[PDB]
Chain A
Amino acid sequence: KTKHLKAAFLRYCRKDILGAQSMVDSLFSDSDMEPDDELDLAVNQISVDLIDDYPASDPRWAESVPEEAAGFSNTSLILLHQLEDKMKAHSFFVDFLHQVGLFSRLSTCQTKGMLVATRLLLSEHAEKLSAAIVLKNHHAKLPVLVNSAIQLALDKRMCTV
């Protein structure tokens, strides 16, 4: 449930600082369910939901630990360096799974016509599409920024503050 994802997101917050407490909140996460076929796909939909908040805005693990996660100003012009910080944040996030976590769980299934063997391909896929973002942030010119403004306005309206 939402309480479990929001408890792992708070144990990643402490994983940047020290491991001992966060290793007991992974040992208490062997008070889990343990049936492979869908409840390990229920801590999958947790590790996936945090790899979608680390590419998003300020990730919801932030607040308690003010690491490289911090609520960076969205009125800043530091868009590229701010997103480099998030490929690093998603890199220490894959490491703080590898040492104490994600040694299982794989719900990729079918997404947008794509079949994928394992949820761990979604970490690699969110990494590849966070390298794509920095590449088109490196290339910023008036034709591409116009083609972007049209795309964004087609998907939804934008706040004009």
Chain B
Amino acid sequence: MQNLEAQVTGSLVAFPDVTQKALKEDEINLDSVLRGKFSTGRTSLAWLACGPQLEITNSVTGERISAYHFSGLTERPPVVVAVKEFTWQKKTGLLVGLVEAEGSVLCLYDIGISKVVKAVVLPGSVTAVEPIINHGGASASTQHLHQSLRWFFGVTAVVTDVGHVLLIDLCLDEVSSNQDELDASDLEVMSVIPTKIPKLREAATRERRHLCLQLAAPTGTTVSCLSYISRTNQLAVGYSDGYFSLWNMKTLRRDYHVQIEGGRVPVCAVAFQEPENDPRNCCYLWAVQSSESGGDVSLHLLQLAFSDRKCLASGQIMYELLEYCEERYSLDLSGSTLSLRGQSNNTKLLGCQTIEKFPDTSVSVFSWQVNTYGQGKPSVYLGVFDINRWYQAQMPDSLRSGQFLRNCSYFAFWSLEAVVNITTQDIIFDILVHERPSTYNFDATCLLNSGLIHFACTGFQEEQLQAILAAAVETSSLGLLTSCIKRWTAEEQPRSAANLRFVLEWTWKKVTLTKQEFDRLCFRLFDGSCNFIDPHTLQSLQQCHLYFSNLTAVLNCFIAQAKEVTQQGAVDLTNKQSVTRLLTLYASVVLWFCRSFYNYQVIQQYYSDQRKKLERLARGKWDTSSLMIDGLINQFGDRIQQLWSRDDNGTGKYPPANLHALLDVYLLENADEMSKHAITIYFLLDIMYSFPDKPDSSIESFPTAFFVPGSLIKLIQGFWLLDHNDYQNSVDCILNPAMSWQHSQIIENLLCHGDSRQALRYLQVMKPVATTSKEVKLHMTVLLANRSILEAWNLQRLHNV
């Protein structure tokens, strides 16, 4: 935990030469301070301002999107003091506060046309601007505002150097007014909330005036920060004397007003956090105190408790009726332990951001710069506070004595020294963390005077090697293991042979241990002790399957790289691979049977009576001692008969005594996978036929889940229908365009039942090769039974005469 460091992910992305020239032209006016910030909206914008110049860049590419040079009424150019993103009527723009020698102007700048579209003259020098709402009218979306403000069309809060708090109507319903900063509208300032706002608004609009509600009278104290908290419906107003106030936009009343514990230091920023679980509807507001001249930076966490929590028609949650607001955590950034000896440090806040995931995750990011007198390079830091971890830490009020930020359970800290080492001449304006605690990983962008820089903040001998190899098999990082095997097989060093042997012996030991655990899990599935699979045992079975697959891939890599293995070692490796592959297949099928009622007695009685029916019909004329399923099972020889006789009530014949005896067919060596799926499909058809009354059975997913060809599906359906006495649909399935013993048995069965015409049709279409004297006699009998004497006679001459 002692040094989390940011890693630079790209080169400096320089701004276009035109943007750099435009920002430098006004450095000739010794009073013009270059400013820049990221926009808090979804539009991925950054803005830079120097005197009257405004530059808008892409927050990722640094490309110039838009720019403007503001004109003033006086020979002195206006200064861009405040900039906020504002989206209205499907347009994207900025609210811009201009300070002039004799006043200030609020401009609405449309980025899409790169022009001012509305301008309003302000009573005093503007210090901050904040949009409250981007539309007007009697909508459900405006119901959280005071009835007065619902008559406005776009509402912006504006604050001044003398302590005014003004709520301005943007008149966004007036499509006919294109105003520039020079043709700015006058403001009709109302000190008392009127009952007849519609008539006053219509009068103001007719006079080309904007309507304004004054919340605060000029106190003579500068407002240093302004923010609208949509979740509490409160306007947060911070003062240069360290006072802080909350104004409720529903009631237009000041709900809270206090001096923050850091004393007479300006409140420069605020950041809202919501906890995952609070029993009393508490939310949190950071208030940051910082001096503009350089000085002490302190972070103050205000707890806001509310009596009620309303879901708006938008699904957004609104806290109502503030009960109390109290300071609950303080952190001095300037006082913390980095100064060995009383050097005057100048500390500056760079950025303050909140990131919330739906919140299950609520984090506040603070970025700050420390300039130590006599060090030419600034130290830049990024701190992440997690409110849910602070709750878990039992809501400490400060860092405990002997705790450092570097070892906090609810605060994480990154050094940006790698960024500073590339940016040795550049001024860092702001730092954006990309929304999309020492264990967090995130990407971020710094805003510079020259351009942008991207960086990533990463989060924090044989037995050690076995633990790493286990982690690589457990995370499916097979590319690591296969690359190590390929290199140790290419490096003819005596240490490489020992490593390859160790990994092979370890791989086989891990297969053996995974099998013991898999058997321990499977034992409960078959013994009838389990009525329901817990999600945990299902996940453990999935994990065992993944491990067998991952270990099979490692063994296949050994087989592929093994050019110089002893004949014994090649056989042993092929046997180990064959075993692990069969275990992978068995685990996959067991897991599928878990993810997906079998009446043994009913199906066994049916197949016992069909075998007896066939024996009676054959009259010893035909070798029809077996059903089509019995012929499919006989391809595996006595192995399935031994497997299905193992369990209590096992006849060694179809159907299997229980589902365990069916699934154990997948563990048979040297059997084709498609032949195993064929027995399972034939079995699933018997179950489906036993339950006609539910069309949406998950059983139909089997052929899709195991990539069974539609060709084999139709063939097995054809065999199933044959054993079910549906000979027409059986032959239609088997003859669909999509073995030697089966030909004889189909023909003998059709002849035993007297359907010589279907036996002839089958013989004419399929043309089975008669190799044995028995097959030739069978084919002669089909031809004679259909009165085809000449064909039977020619067949006799052709084949034994």
Contacts and interface: CB of A to CB of B under 8 A. Distances in A.
Contacts of A58: 494
Contacts of A76: 566
B203 interface: no
Interface in B65-95: none
B493 A63 contact: yes
A23 interface: no
Interface string A57-76: 01000110010001101001
Contacts of B566: 76
A50 B366 CA distance: 64
Interface in A32-63: 58, 62-63
Interface in B457-507: 492-494, 497
Contacts of B497: 71, 73
A81 B566 CA distance: 16
B499 to A, nearest CB: 13
Contacts of A66: 492
B500 to A, nearest CB: 11
Contacts of B493: 63, 71
A130 B492 CA distance: 24
Nearest to A58: B494
Contacts of B494: 58, 71
A73 B494 CA distance: 8
Interface string A85-101: 00000000000000000
Contacts of B492: 62-63, 66, 70-71
B495 to A, nearest CB: 9
Interface centre among A58, A63, A71, A76, by most chain B C-beta atoms within 10 angstroms, is: A71
Contacts of A71: 492-494, 497
A83 B566 CA distance: 19
Interface string B588-609: 0000000000000000000000
A64 to B, nearest CB: 11
Interface residues of B, number: 5
Nearest to B501: A75
A109 to B, nearest CB: 33
Interface string A104-134: 0000000000000000000000000000000
A71 B490 CA distance: 12
Contacts of A73: 497
Contacts of A63: 492-493
A70 B494 CA distance: 9
A151 to B, nearest CB: 25
B300 to A, nearest CB: 64
Nearest to B495: A71
A3 B497 CA distance: 27
A58 B566 CA distance: 20
A158 B799 CA distance: 75
Interface centre among B493, B494, B497, B566, by most chain A C-beta atoms within 10 angstroms, is: B494
A62 B493 CA distance: 9
A70 B493 CA distance: 8
B213 to A, nearest CB: 84
A32 B393 CA distance: 70
Nearest to A70: B492
Interface in B543-584: 566
A13 B750 CA distance: 81
A76 B494 CA distance: 13
Nearest to A66: B492
A66 to B, nearest CB: 5
A58 B497 CA distance: 13
B286 to A, nearest CB: 60
A33 to B, nearest CB: 34
A63 B497 CA distance: 14
B490 to A, nearest CB: 10
Nearest to A62: B492
A71 B566 CA distance: 16
Nearest to B564: A73
A76 B569 CA distance: 11
Interface string B303-339: 0000000000000000000000000000000000000
A84 B674 CA distance: 53
Contacts of A62: 492
B108 to A, nearest CB: 72
Interface in A145-161: none
A71 B488 CA distance: 13
A123 to B, nearest CB: 26
A104 B566 CA distance: 45
A80 B494 CA distance: 19
A76 B566 CA distance: 8
A145 to B, nearest CB: 21
A70 to B, nearest CB: 5
A66 B493 CA distance: 10
B573 to A, nearest CB: 15
A27 B494 CA distance: 33
A71 B500 CA distance: 14
A58 B496 CA distance: 14
A100 B493 CA distance: 28
A32 B492 CA distance: 33
A66 B492 CA distance: 8
B335 to A, nearest CB: 55
B571 to A, nearest CB: 16
A58 B495 CA distance: 12
Nearest to A63: B493
Nearest to A77: B566
Nearest to B491: A63
A63 B494 CA distance: 10
A58 B492 CA distance: 10
A157 to B, nearest CB: 20
Interface in B493-537: 493-494, 497
B392 to A, nearest CB: 51
B561 to A, nearest CB: 15
Contacts of A70: 492
Nearest to B569: A75
B494 to A, nearest CB: 5
B187 to A, nearest CB: 83
Nearest to B498: A161
A70 B497 CA distance: 12
Nearest to B496: A71
A71 B499 CA distance: 14
Interface centre among B492, B493, B566, by most chain A C-beta atoms within 10 angstroms, is: B492
B783 to A, nearest CB: 66
A63 B566 CA distance: 23
B770 to A, nearest CB: 55
A46 to B, nearest CB: 23
A82 to B, nearest CB: 13
B33 to A, nearest CB: 62
A68 B494 CA distance: 15
A63 B492 CA distance: 7
A77 to B, nearest CB: 8
A83 B493 CA distance: 18
A81 to B, nearest CB: 14
A58 B493 CA distance: 9
A76 B497 CA distance: 12
Interface in B712-749: none
Sorted nearest first, the 6 A-B pairs with minimum C-beta distance are: A71-B494, A70-B492, A71-B492, A66-B492, A71-B493, A58-B494
Interface of B: 492-494, 497, 566
Interface of A: 58, 62-63, 66, 70-71, 73, 76
Given A63-B493, A71-B492, A71-B493, 9 more contacts: A58-B494, A62-B492, A63-B492, A66-B492, A70-B492, A71-B494, A71-B497, A73-B497, A76-B566
12 contacts: A58-B494, A62-B492, A63-B492, A63-B493, A66-B492, A70-B492, A71-B492, A71-B493, A71-B494, A71-B497, A73-B497, A76-B566
